[PDB]
């Protein structure tokens, strides 16, 4: 959300997931990322939409995007004697998507 | 990386405490120091004078560093050279000799003592 | 160019209330005044130094409530040790419940509410204009010292330091004595001499100053 | 009458309605005559339904919420006058309620930068504006009633009182009465309160049929002509107005004798109170005694006023009830 | 009105840990919700096959070819018709309770508020899901909402029963998580007394034959081994599907397996 320099009204501006509508968004090093930033794609990964309620703007956008992500396991390397849940830090809500 | 580090100590000593308080009170009591000669001498030594090093400094400096290495890093020798060449700028000269390197090593080892 | 309150009060008193909550930005100015009394000015291309000789009267609030059987006075308040050392005198006034004192305090407070006049007593309130006239006249006066008087000050200071070497204990006292304490002893003797006396200072004046400092120091328990 | 219980808080609100007598003192000082009350308690304890009642019953009342308020919105704001062209000041919530009451809800959820301003108004009762070439002191003499919640969801009796309340001590010292209220599970209390609530929810306004939705619209007919026993609300409003404007009691010695003994007894005891006792408790006793004297429509403070004030403050601080 | 959805900490409910370590919402916000639904997966095969068939019918196009028919006949209505019915009902009716409805609601409030006291005393920790007066007002609102559907001008015991059942399904179920074991201070002696009583019961009673709760109380308590918490120990042994079965209106305790 940005203030328009000319009109001086709050307006919406695009992002990475909106620039890649009907495209592909690639996220390298997906495990070395803040949880607050990672959790922003929960709605876009399944519902394929973005909802904003800020500064008098109440809108829903559209992001029909596919995500291919690459990550590293805990310790930098995979332990084949352990289950998956103890080789990564991600939880079920993001692994199911 | 600091060339000289000094530790100022304050210990409860009767002689030192009395002597300090005495001259402090004497200063408060109402009853060989040049004023601006220092500034002009400093400017003269800094703007015209450039000393050099001779083999007399070589002979003392190398053996002094080795004797200090009988945990002195290589920074120590470049610290001695700077102090010796700064002392040479004093007692106005144009070259270093044994007195300057002796004073420099004495200063840098008295620094080590603390 | 707009000067601050510290600069504004020259040869005057700066009363800093709620000094605990005041920010480090002002702590810089408080630190510098006690050191040199000459305020350096903002960086708006003027490079100005302004005279700021002033006296400081600070009121403090201990951290999280009241006094705490935590032994260190540094733990009671946020103020750094260096900042407190520059202060000439520190006074602790702790509220200790005592059955006798509460009765007189309540009576004194309630007399003011019943009758607006303050409670009449043998103590006589001197007229305030006389207060100002005497204070100004004392301020104009200039004392002077003698060599004999300051000799006993050295003995007092060495006794204080020999006490301070063993005074380091669990609860009482704040660090150790510093030459600034000797300086403040003479500085306080100045005012007690200016109060009524003139020319050379009396020997008992040093005793009075030492007594006031010692009572303030002993206020740490009380 | 739609709140079950909370008798002591309802007495404190009434004493707020009939404020104390303000004393103007030398050195340009004034002793405040307002009574300020804080309520800390568990969720769903009818804290917010008393602030709403005070909003309606009082002559002047201003409502405030912690998170939806700012410092410039409580004291004053610099604006411009379009018609003439100068720059002027616009009043905020605190100064608009001069000789009135301010009811603040979710008081603990207020930001720190917001909470300093209310401090000054609670202490000096004046606002200082030194912005944009407008140097002014504004009068704000208002009574504060506030409601908050503890740090956790519910009050804990196994922890010290200061840990339960997130408010600082300086702010907490400026309230005359702090009421900690707790919901305790008991079958008889539940049976009575559930019966009361179910009786309340079965009320039909006159002129309405069963199942008829309430038509809170008035059909654009704004006005017809353009200009044990309980008491009705307008009569209470008349009583409060008459008491505030017609009686100014003065303190007496025999009441002071009771006040001093209560203060001395309270100060020197090992009981653990929810709030510390200090030299400002005496002023609270005096103010409560003056208010109770006004309630009686009398020009002097009697011993009974001191007894009632003592009982109220003992309940507030100790809960000895 | 507010309709909210959220996930627990760690993603899944993790029934192994305490409810207080699973819900991050404070008591202040949780008291403003009339109904709270905790949703879990049971991983049953029959349900999985039914859901799989239902979802595949949606994708293969068999969904619409069915739905219209029911929407035609008598069992479903369109979105617009239901919207118009909702607005008509909200703008026409506002029911009221009956004297018997209040009596039935007060007793239910007393019961559901008593149960919380026993639960909190047993678990020696405060409940994360609170029960307050708002929970009584919620049931009143649900009763009146149920009455609103039929355009009835009065709410009666028929609606009260369904409102009570909905509240039990929604909030009392969430409150009554019934932890099998938390290894906390509560039931600390039980950490060994459970195994002790299980061994004493399995040595007394072979794999056949039955006993009674009356006898299993009187005789095993004459030795002063009672703990007041053995009511759920029998159910926990039953959970093993072998130790205990309850028959004959709960009177008979039958040993069924190892
Ligand atoms: N003693 C009571 N008598 C009548 N109604 C009550 C009582 N206590 C609570 N209630 C009811 O509980 C509901 C919520 O009360 P209220 O909003 O005043 O609570 P609160 O203390 O402000 O809560 P919160 O901590 O959630 O802000 C209201 O419907 C109110 O009528
Ligand atoms: Mg509320």
Give a topology summary.
This is part of a larger assembly, with chains A (97 residues), B (114 residues), C (222 residues), D (321 residues) and E (258 residues).
Chain A: E1 2-3, E2 10-11, H1 16-19, E3 23-27, H2 35-38, H3 42-46, E4 49-54, E5 57-62, E6 65-69, H4 92-95
Parallel strand pairs in A: 3-6
Antiparallel strand pairs in A: 1-2, 4-5
Chain B: H1 14-28, H2 37-47, H3 55-68, H4 74-89, H5 98-113
Helix pairs in contact in B: 3-5, 4-5
Chain D: H1 7-17, E1 23-25, E2 29-31, E3 37-41, H2 48-57, E4 61-65, H3 71-74, E5 76-80, E6 87-91, H4 93-96, E7 100-105, H5 112-123, E8 126-131, E9 134-139, E10 142-148, H6 161-164, H7 169-172, E11 177-181, H8 187-200, H9 233-246, H10 253-267, H11 281-295, H12 303-318
Parallel strand pairs in D: 3-10, 3-11, 4-7, 7-10
Antiparallel strand pairs in D: 1-2, 5-6, 8-9
Helix pairs in contact in D: 10-11, 10-12, 11-12
Bound molecules: adenosine-5'-triphosphate and magnesium ion.
The site of magnesium ion (MG) has 3 residues of chain D, from loops.
Model description:
The structure is cut from a larger assembly and holds chains A (97 residues), B (114 residues), C (222 residues), D (321 residues) and E (258 residues). Chain A has four helices and six strands, in the order E-E-H-E-H-H-E-E-E-H. Chain A is an alpha+beta fold. Helix content of chain B is 63%, strand content 0%. Chain B has five helices and no strands. In chain E, helix 6 (133-149) packs across helix 7. Chain E contains ten helices and three strands; from the N terminus they run H-H-H-H-H-H-H-H-E-H-H-E-E. A three-stranded antiparallel sheet of chain E has the order 1-3-2. The termini of chain E are far apart. The chains are: A alpha+beta (97), B mainly alpha (114), C mainly alpha (222), D alpha/beta (321), E mainly alpha (258). It is classed as replication.
């Amino acid at each position: 959300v940005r203030k328009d320099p000319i009109t001086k009204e709050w307006t919406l501006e695009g992002g990475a997931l909106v620039l890649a509508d009907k495209g592909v968004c690639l996220i390298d090093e997906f495990d070395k990322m803040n949880d607050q930033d990672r959790t922003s794609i929960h709605e876009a990964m399944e519902q394929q939409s973005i909802s904003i309620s800020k500064a008098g703007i109440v809108t829903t956008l559209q992001a029909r995007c596919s995500i291919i992500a690459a990550a590293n396991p805990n310790g930098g390397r995979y332990n084949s004697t352990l289950p998956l849940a103890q080789n990564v830090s991600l939880t079920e809500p993001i692994l199911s998507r | 990386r600091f060339d000289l580090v000094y530790l100022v100590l304050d210990k409860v000593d009767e002689k030192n405490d009395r002597e300090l308080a005495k001259h402090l009170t004497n200063l408060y009591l109402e009853d060989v120091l040049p004023v601006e000669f220092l500034t002009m001498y400093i400017s003269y030594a800094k703007e015209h004078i450039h000393p050099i090093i001779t083999e007399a400094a070589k002979t003392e400096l190398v053996r002094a560093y080795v004797g200090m290495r009988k945990t002195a890093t290589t920074r120590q020798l470049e610290s001695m050279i700077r102090l010796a060449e700064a002392h040479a700028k004093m007692k106005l000269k144009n070259v270093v000799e044994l007195e300057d390197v002796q004073e420099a090593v004495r200063l840098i080892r008295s620094a080590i003592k603390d | 160019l707009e000067g601050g309150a510290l600069v504004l009060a020259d040869n005057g008193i700066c009363c800093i209330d709620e000094f605990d909550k005041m920010d480090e930005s002002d702590r810089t100015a408080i630190h510098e005044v006690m050191e040199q009394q000459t305020i350096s000015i903002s960086k708006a291309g003027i490079n100005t130094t302004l005279n700021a000789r002033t006296s400081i009267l600070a009121a403090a609030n201990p951290l999280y409530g009241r006094y705490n059987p935590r032994l260190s006075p540094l733990d009671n308040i946020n103020l750094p040790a260096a900042l407190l050392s520059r202060f000439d005198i520190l006074f602790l006034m702790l509220d200790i419940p005592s059955r006798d004192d509460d009765e007189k305090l309540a009576e004194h407070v309630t007399y003011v509410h019943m009758h607006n006049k303050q409670p009449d007593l043998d103590f006589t309130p001197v007229e305030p204009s006389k207060m100002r006239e005497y204070i100004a006249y004392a301020k104009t006066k200039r004392p002077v010292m003698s060599e004999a008087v300051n000799d006993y000050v050295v003995q007092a200071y060495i006794r204080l330091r020999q006490d301070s070497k063993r005074e380091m204990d669990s609860k009482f006292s704040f660090g150790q004595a510093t030459p600034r304490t000797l300086l403040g002893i003479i500085r306080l003797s100045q005012a007690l001499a200016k109060l009524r006396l003139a020319d050379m200072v009396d020997i008992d004046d040093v005793e009075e100053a030492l007594r006031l400092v010692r009572v303030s120091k002993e206020s740490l328990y009380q | 009458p739609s709140i079950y219980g909370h008798d002591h808080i309802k007495k404190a609100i009434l004493l707020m309605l009939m404020g104390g007598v303000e004393k103007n003192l030398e050195n340009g000082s004034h002793l405040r005559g307002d009574i300020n009350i804080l309520m800390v308690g568990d969720p769903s304890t009818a804290k917010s339904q008393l602030l709403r009642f005070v909003l309606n019953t009082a002559s002047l009342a201003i409502a405030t919420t912690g998170r939806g308020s700012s410092g410039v919105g409580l004291t004053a704001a610099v604006t411009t006058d379009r018609e003439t062209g100068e720059r002027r000041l616009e009043a905020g919530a605190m100064v608009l309620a001069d000789r009135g009451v301010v009811c603040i809800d979710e008081f603990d959820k207020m930001t720190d930068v917001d909470r300093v301003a209310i401090h000054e108004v609670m202490e000096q009762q004046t606002v200082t504006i030194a912005k944009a070439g407008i140097h002014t002191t504004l009068n704000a003499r208002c009574s504060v009633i506030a409601a908050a919640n503890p740090v956790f969801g519910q009050y804990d009796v196994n922890r010290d009182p200061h840990q339960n309340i997130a408010l600082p001590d300086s702010l907490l010292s400026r309230f005359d009465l702090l009421f900690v209220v707790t919901d305790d599970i008991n079958e008889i209390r539940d049976r009575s309160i559930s019966e009361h609530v179910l009786r309340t929810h079965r009320y039909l306004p006159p002129g309405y049929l069963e199942g008829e939705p309430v038509r809170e619209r008035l059909n654009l007919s704004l006005a017809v002509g353009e200009d044990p026993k309980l008491v009705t609300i307008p009569f209470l409003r008349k009583y409060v107005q008459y008491a505030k404007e017609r009686v100014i009691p003065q303190l007496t010695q025999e009441a002071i004798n009771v006040i001093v003994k209560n203060y001395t007894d309270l100060r020197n005891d090992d009981n653990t109170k929810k709030s510390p006792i200090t030299a400002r408790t005496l002023e609270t006793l005096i103010r409560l005694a003056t208010a109770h004297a006004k309630v009686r429509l009398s020009k002097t403070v009697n011993k009974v006023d001191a007894k009632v004030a003592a009982n109220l403050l003992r309940f507030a601080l100790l809960g000895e009830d | 009105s507010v309709l909210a959805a959220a996930n627990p900490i760690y993603g899944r409910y993790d029934d192994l840990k305490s409810p207080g370590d699973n819900i991050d919402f404070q008591t202040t916000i949780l008291s403003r919700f009339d109904m709270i639904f905790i949703v879990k997966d049971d991983h049953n095969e029959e349900r999985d096959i039914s859901i799989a068939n239902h979802v595949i019918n949606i994708h293969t196009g068999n969904a619409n070819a069915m739905q219209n028919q029911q929407e035609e006949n008598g069992s479903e209505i369109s979105i617009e018709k239901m919207k118009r019915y909702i607005t008509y009902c909200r703008l026409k009716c506002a029911p009221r309770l009956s004297p018997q409805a209040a009596e039935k609601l007060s007793s239910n409030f007393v019961t559901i508020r008593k149960q919380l006291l026993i639960n909190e005393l047993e678990s020696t920790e405060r409940s994360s899901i609170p029960i307050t007066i708002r929970q009584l007002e919620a049931i009143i609102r649900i009763t009146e909402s149920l009455a609103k559907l039929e355009l009835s001008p009065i709410a009666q015991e028929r609606h009260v029963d369904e409102a009570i059942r909905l509240f039990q399904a929604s909030t009392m179920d969430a409150a009554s998580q019934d932890p099998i074991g938390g290894l906390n201070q509560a039931s600390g002696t039980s950490l060994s007394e459970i195994r002790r009583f299980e061994q004493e019961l399995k040595r007394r009673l072979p794999i056949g034959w039955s006993t009674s709760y009356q006898t299993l109380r009187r005789e095993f308590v004459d030795t002063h081994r009672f703990s007041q918490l053995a009511l759920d120990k029998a159910l926990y042994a039953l959970e093993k599907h072998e130790t205990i079965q309850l028959r004959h209106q709960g009177q008979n305790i039958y040993r069924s397996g190892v």
